[PDB]
Amino acid sequence: TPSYLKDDDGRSLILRGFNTASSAKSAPDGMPQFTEADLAREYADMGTNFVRFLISWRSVEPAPGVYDQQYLDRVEDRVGWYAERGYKVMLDMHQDVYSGAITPEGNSGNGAGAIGNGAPAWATYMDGLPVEPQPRWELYYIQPGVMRAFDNFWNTTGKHPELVEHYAKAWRAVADRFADNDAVVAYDLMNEPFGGSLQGPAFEAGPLAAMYQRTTDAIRQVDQDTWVCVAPQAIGVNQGLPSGLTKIDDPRAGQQRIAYCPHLYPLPLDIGDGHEGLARTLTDVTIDAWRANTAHTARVLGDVPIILGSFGLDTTLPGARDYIERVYGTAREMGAGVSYWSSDPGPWGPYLPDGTQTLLVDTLNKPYPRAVAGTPTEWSSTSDRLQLTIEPDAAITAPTEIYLPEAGFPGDVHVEGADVVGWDRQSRLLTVRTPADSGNVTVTVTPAA
């Protein structure tokens, strides 16, 4: 059965939010094009309680050994917006195709970029190997200069043992700033690791795991309590193949706080431009295969919690809502958190460029338990109902906290199996208390007559 991240009250967290935001990748100041008013809109429309907040190595460490505390001030400012609205934050050290420094035309400055993004220019060593224009961005991964930049980072070439050490110490700098931040729950060490010339389990169990171990150790010099979240290699594994990632040791006193944060991008959904016919058949197989592989690696890592850190699609495609609902149902059964890709404007996201909602908003805006006083064994919801079964824990005194959308709960609530402590119609938060002396408790929440 699944394991959960916990809040300071000991409640088990069911995490629902977005990646915010891809616009940070190219921004000179490292910040997403996302305001406090945008967060208020998100919360009002969907009741989210989590964010995978994109940060970047190029912003943390713009020159070797010279950390930018002003950038960290900016991150802290945004984290405060989230804190004020009761969100938990996972910071993602984000890259795609290594760096903006992989081409001159795509480099928005010092490794920032709209396509390639992440590492600072000083950490990018392509050794003069070419990077030719490609018709979709993912193809840059296999261009010679990008492959070489990764091979140098992982020190496959033997020429750059320092780069992983810089990466680990950049994470330590972030962790030193955020250790005492009560809204931060997780550090996602690297978006979509790619091995370059080294592929599969030899990469994952070799230099990838070694970087995760070094970085975990560095973070634990300054932060004992934040969950350290590790990803498999993305290529193949995103598409349903197994990971060879191996266990990371957590030097913290007591129980380990490592979590697993894989992504889900079925190939048939992409190539088929939607979720109908044989593409749907094969995407459903992918989801199920992915679930089994994800559960396996989460066991290997020490029976750890899971966060689906990224998944998404163009919501206008045939079958999109069915796909989204399938993924969220799977995450629910797995006890997984979810950060959807992404909050950015356009048909993948919740809002179009003019601020109009896509179908994503209504799809995501469902009741869910946010923080449960005990282990949630099973739950379900529809627009106007939620049911939740809880394995009791008498040590927890904080109430179970549940989001109820206005759409289905226009007035008061009726709760079977628990006492209502609070029903805040402004914040949309229901708080309930359940007995801890009668075994597993089932709570059913419906609109008042």
Q: How far is the CB of 122 from Na ion (least distance, A)?
A: 6
Residue 259 is a binding residue for Na ion (CB under 5 A): no
Residue 210 is a binding residue for Na ion (CB under 5 A): no
From the list 39, 184, 234, 279, which residue makes contact with Na ion (rule: CB under 5 A)? Answer: 184
Whether 25 and 96 have beta carbons less than 8 Å apart is answered as yes
Residue 50 CB partners (closer than 8 Å, separation 6+): 15, 16, 17, 87, 88, 89, 90, 337, 338, 339
Q: How far is the CB of 363 from Na ion (least distance, A)?
A: 30
Q: How far apart are CA 217 and CA 252, in angstroms?
A: 9
* Choices 8-16, 33-41, 184-192, 290-298 (CB under 5 A): range interacting with Na ion: 184-192
Return the residues of window 121-180 that contact Na ion according to CB under 5 A: 121, 124
Q: Which of 51, 13, 11, 8 is nearest to 335 (CA)?
A: 13
Residue 75 is a binding residue for Na ion (CB under 5 A): no
Provide the residue type at 115 as one letter.
Answer: I
Residue 392 CB partners (closer than 8 Å, separation 6+): 374, 434, 435, 436, 437, 438, 439, 440, 441
Q: How far is the CB of 250 from Na ion (least distance, A)?
A: 4
Q: How far is the CB of 159 from Na ion (least distance, A)?
A: 13
- Other Cβ atoms closer than 10 A to 140: 22
Q: How far apart are CA 194 and CA 99, in angstroms?
A: 13
Residue 38 is a binding residue for Na ion (CB under 5 A): no
**Sheet with 184-188, side-by-side order of all strands:** 258-260, 227-230, 184-188, 88-93, 50-55, 16-20, 337-340, 307-308
Judged by beta carbon, residue 101 or residue 327, the one nearer Na ion is: 101
Return the residues of window 87-126 that contact Na ion according to CB under 5 A: 121, 124
Judged by beta carbon, residue 111 or residue 312, the one nearer Na ion is: 111
425 DSSP 8-state letter? T
Residue 250 is a binding residue for Na ion (CB under 5 A): yes
Judged by beta carbon, residue 184 or residue 331, the one nearer Na ion is: 184
Q: How far is the CB of 53 from Na ion (least distance, A)?
A: 13
Q: How far apart are CA 154 and CA 162, in angstroms?
A: 10
Judged by beta carbon, residue 48 or residue 124, the one nearer Na ion is: 124
Q: Count residues contacting Na ion (CB under 5 A)?
A: 7
Q: How far is the CB of 70 from Na ion (least distance, A)?
A: 9
| Residue 346: C-alpha distances to residues 63, 356, 357 (Å) | 34, 10, 10
Judged by beta carbon, residue 113 or residue 349, the one nearer Na ion is: 113
User: Strand, helix or coil at 233?
Assistant: coil
Binding site for Na ion (CB under 5 A): 28, 121, 124, 181, 184, 250, 256
